[PDB]
Structure 1
Amino acid sequence: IKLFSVLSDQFQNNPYAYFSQLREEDPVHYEESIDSYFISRYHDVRYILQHPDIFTTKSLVERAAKRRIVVRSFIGDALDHLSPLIKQNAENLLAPYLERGKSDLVNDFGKTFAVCVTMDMLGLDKRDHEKISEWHSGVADFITSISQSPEARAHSLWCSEQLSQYLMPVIKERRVNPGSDLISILCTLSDKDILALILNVLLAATEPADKTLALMIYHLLNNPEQMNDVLADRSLVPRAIAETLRYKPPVQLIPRQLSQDTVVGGMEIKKDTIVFCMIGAANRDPEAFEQPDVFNIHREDLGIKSAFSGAARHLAFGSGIHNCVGTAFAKNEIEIVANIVLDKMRNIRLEEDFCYAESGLYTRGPVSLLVAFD
């Protein structure tokens, strides 16, 4: 019986083995330790994201009316000016790995890459990608964890202290002479509010991007004919990005607190309680997608022309008026790296005896990705 916990070691070894069980027999799955309900079905999940008056949310600031419009119109104008930067970042970061013909896309290249991109977005110095990459974890670990050793929380708090002490001077600096980056622009609306937006944009643009790339490569390689497809026609890359997003969404839950007494699915839920949209479940629901547990970049129901917008078929960006602002931007970013990886690592295989693993419950990705090449 689904009394089973979606927070168990058992579940984290493989979320996809239990989604059917859930959306079919306990589609509004209640949790014991947290006082929250886990929503399994597609059309429920979609309705939740579509209605934020009833289902409020908060921003990823936590322990240290809409402005997204200007943020989105930054990312739309900026997207052009960042393309050679995103391009250089990839080329540069791969440079040390080409001689050996061997690499770990998650741990040698991925995280570092995602960081430098966000840094260009915020116009920071890429000499500091390490400090920033490390601090970024600490805060993120805080958000993503169910519990923390007093050490880890002591450590996350530090990362946070450290980050704002780094960014805040830069805000004053640009407040008085802007440039063509986000921080400069957000200053043209309080000092500390700008710190919050930046921070949010730092956590949001960073965690998922590295993750998806690895995922896409992995599943491309695991279906080598589909790989060869993308090798011979590169306009395929988006469908390939998109189908990875549905298959194995990097962000796995999207919270919503409840503004009222309300019902969706079987049980009647009460005021001020928070729910978790299970995105994996939704994108593996037979009711939205045909042969849902099959990776196919060529699926007729992906809806590619809509895959990266406010009203897409898959939901790894969320859905509606409150979806990931950097969808346009993410698209291009992953598009660019993918092509660069594909170009530089001629004949990519998976490493002999490479056994594959995913870790994450709130955000999920490969632990590592051992590819070999020419």
Structure 2
Amino acid sequence: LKVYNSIFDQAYEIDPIPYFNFLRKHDPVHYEESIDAYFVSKYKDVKYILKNNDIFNTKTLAKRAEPVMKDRVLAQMSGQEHKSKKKAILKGMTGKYLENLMPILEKRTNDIINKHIEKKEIDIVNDFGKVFAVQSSMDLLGINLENYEKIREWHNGIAKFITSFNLNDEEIKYSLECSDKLENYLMPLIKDRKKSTKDDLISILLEYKNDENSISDTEILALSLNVLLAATEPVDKTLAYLFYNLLKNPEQFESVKNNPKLIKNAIIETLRYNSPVQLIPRQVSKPFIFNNTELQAGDTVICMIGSANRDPEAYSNPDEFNIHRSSDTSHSQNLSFGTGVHTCVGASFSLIQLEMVAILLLKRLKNIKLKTMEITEHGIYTRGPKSMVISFD
């Protein structure tokens, strides 16, 4: 039976919401032959997939990412190893490490603001988010900001490899060249940190011990690259989406201005409404069936986080932005950080960092007005506005 609606239609990337509605209603487990994978659109099926790491495993991430990551990433691990190494990464963004980091992130934020405050406008995507996001990631890791701009360039190249389907011969080579340059820059710093242990995540990874057993330097590089990629991408997107959605709903923007504590809920609702990480793949380990769609071992399923997060079975009026949602007619925990074993280790830090930035932008940019009246969004795997310019006094 031929199907005519395709994730890879040009219309989908422009506006995927009609596709989410169609797929959830008429094809919740939808086959795409161009990448030999099934797309899963409903909240309850995505949740089930992500909660069942034994049936739907993370082995698909060994060729979609490992070629550029140089070694095993966290998502490829399991058992005590995954648990202990995930805890090590969390350590770098909790406790005293978090206390130390946040003032630095405040400095990053105000320095960017100060560069733009006299121009009376700023592009939350291109002026703020893309700069802050990589700087924050480098501060978290302990990489000094001198070669910051080249770090951005390479990051973009590796990201493209991981977030893209059916890359051509020349795109693959550039992504790998970016991976090598990043490897060539970062390895000496790991070697230096090996002797000069600092209070950063790189040092944590060097100090880690699996029973008097350290992890190879190339293992630390991949995990460091895993953190750089993981933390940078979603930050610019979410910040842009947050202020866009608030300014498009002036009542809610004012509520946030009058009650700063509502900022957390606005970020959460932004993550639900405009999920910046859109797709999460898994590999099927054994015959399985959702609705009446049969899956075989070896098949690939791709969870559609944005679709799930707008499922009317999980949220009332799911396609409306409302920072005042709560479970106290229908509300659920959003899947924007995933769920189960591989739930985003950086979830709490992300909410803290985004609230810090939002509060400073709201403090320092007075009488914010929207200038980008209508956004253009790009990306199907990770996804955000091209530009989001605001004006201010």
**TM-score for the superposition, normalised by structure 1:** 0.94
Q: Is the 8 A contact 1:212 1:365 kept in 2?
A: yes
Q: Which amino acid aligns with 1:205?
A: A
Whether 1:334 aligns to 2:361 is no
Q: How many residues align?
A: 366
Partner SS state of residue 63, structure 1 = helix
Equivalent residues of 1:260, 1:272 under 8 A apart = yes
The answer to whether the 8 Å contact 1:245/1:316 transfers is yes
CA distance in 2, matches of 1:327, 1:355: 29
SS at match of 1:164: helix
* Correspondence for 1:123: 142
- Quote the Cα distance in structure 1 between the aligned partners of 2:123 and 2:187: 34
Q: Counterpart of 1:57 in structure 2: which amino acid?
A: T
Distance (Å, rounded) in 1 between the aligned partners of 2:166 and 2:392: 40
Taking the aligned partners of 1:92 and 1:138, their CA distance within structure 2 comes to 26
2:211 counterpart residue number: none
Instruction: Give the AA of the match of 1:22.
Output: L
Contact 1:211 1:365 in 2 (8 A): yes
Moved more, 96-105 or 66-75: 66-75
AA aligned opposite 1:313 = Q
8 Å CA contact retained: 1:23, 1:41: yes
2:316 maps to 1:290: yes
Secondary structure at the aligned position of 1:296 is classed as coil
Aligned to 1:204: 230
TM normalised by structure 2 equals 0.90
Kindly report which structure 2 residues correspond to 1:75-86, keeping only aligned pairs within 5 A, or say none. Answer: 75-77=93-95, 78-86=97-105
Contact 2:65–2:161 (8 Å) recurs in 1: no
C-alpha distance in structure 2 between counterparts of 1:212 and 1:301, whole Å: 23
The one of 165, 173, 191 equivalent to 1:154 is: 173
Distance 2:245 2:108 in 1: 24
Counterpart residue identity of residue 112, structure 2: L
Q: CA deviation at 1:300?
A: 2.1
- What is the distance in 2 between the residues matched to 1:8 and 1:31? 11
Specify the alignment match of 2:67 in structure 1.
63
Question: Could you list the per-position Cα deviations for residues 160-217 of structure 1 after superposition, in whole angstroms to 9, with x for gaps in the alignment?
Answer: 1100001111111111221100111101111111011001011001100111000000
Say which of 262, 266, 275 aligns to 1:240.
266
Specify every segment of 5 or more residues in structure 2 that has no aligned partner in the other structure, as ranges: 69-80, 208-214
| Aligned position for 1:46 | 47
Q: Matched residue of 1:286: which SS? A: coil
Contact 2:35 2:165 in 1 (8 A): no
Structure 1 residue aligned with 2:28: 27
Which aligned runs of 4 or more in structure 1 are off by greater than 3 angstroms? 58-61, 147-151
Q: Give 1:129 deviation, angstroms.
A: 1.3
Matched, 1:315 2:335: yes
- 1:270 is displaced (CA, Å) by 0.5
Partner SS, residue 280 of structure 2: strand
Q: Deviations over 1:219-270 (max 9, x none)?
A: 0000011001111111111000000011010000001011222223321100
**Aligned-residue offset at 1:54:** 1.2
Shift in Å, 1:71? 1.4
Task: Kindly state the Cα deviation for residue 354 of structure 1 after the two structures are TM-superposed.
Answer: 4.1
Shift of the 10–192 alpha-carbon distance from structure 1 to 2, 3 Å rule, reads same
- Indicate whether 1:274 and 2:304 are aligned: no
Residue identity over aligned pairs, in percent, reads 47
Deviation (angstroms), 1:126? 1.0
Secondary structure of 2:339's partner? Answer: coil
d(CA) in 2 for partners of 1:61, 1:150: 16
**Does structure 2 conserve the Cα–Cα contact (< 8 Å) formed by 1:2 and 1:22?**
no
Deviation at 1:2, TM superposition (A): 4.7
Q: Which amino acid aligns with 2:337?
A: F
Q: Indicate if the aligned counterparts of 1:347 and 1:373 stay in contact, CA closer than 8 A.
A: yes
Aligned to 2:195: 176
Gaps of at least 5 residues in structure 1 are: none
| In structure 1, C-alpha distance between the alignment counterparts of 2:261 and 2:149, rounded to whole Å | 33
Q: Aligned match of 1:299 in 325, 330, 333?
A: 325
Q: Secondary structure at the match of 1:113?
A: helix
Displacement of 1:147 in angstroms is 3.3
> For the residues of structure 2 that align with 1:321 and 1:90, how far apart are their CA atoms?
32
Contact between 1:138 and 1:159, CA under 8 Å: does it hold in 2? yes
Q: Could you say if the C-alpha distance between residues 157 and 254 of structure 1 is closer, same or farther in structure 2, counting changes exceeding 3 Å?
A: same
Q: Deviations over 1:308-362 (max 9, x none)?
A: xxxx7000000122200011110111011111111121111111x7432111100
| 1:13 and 2:10 aligned | no
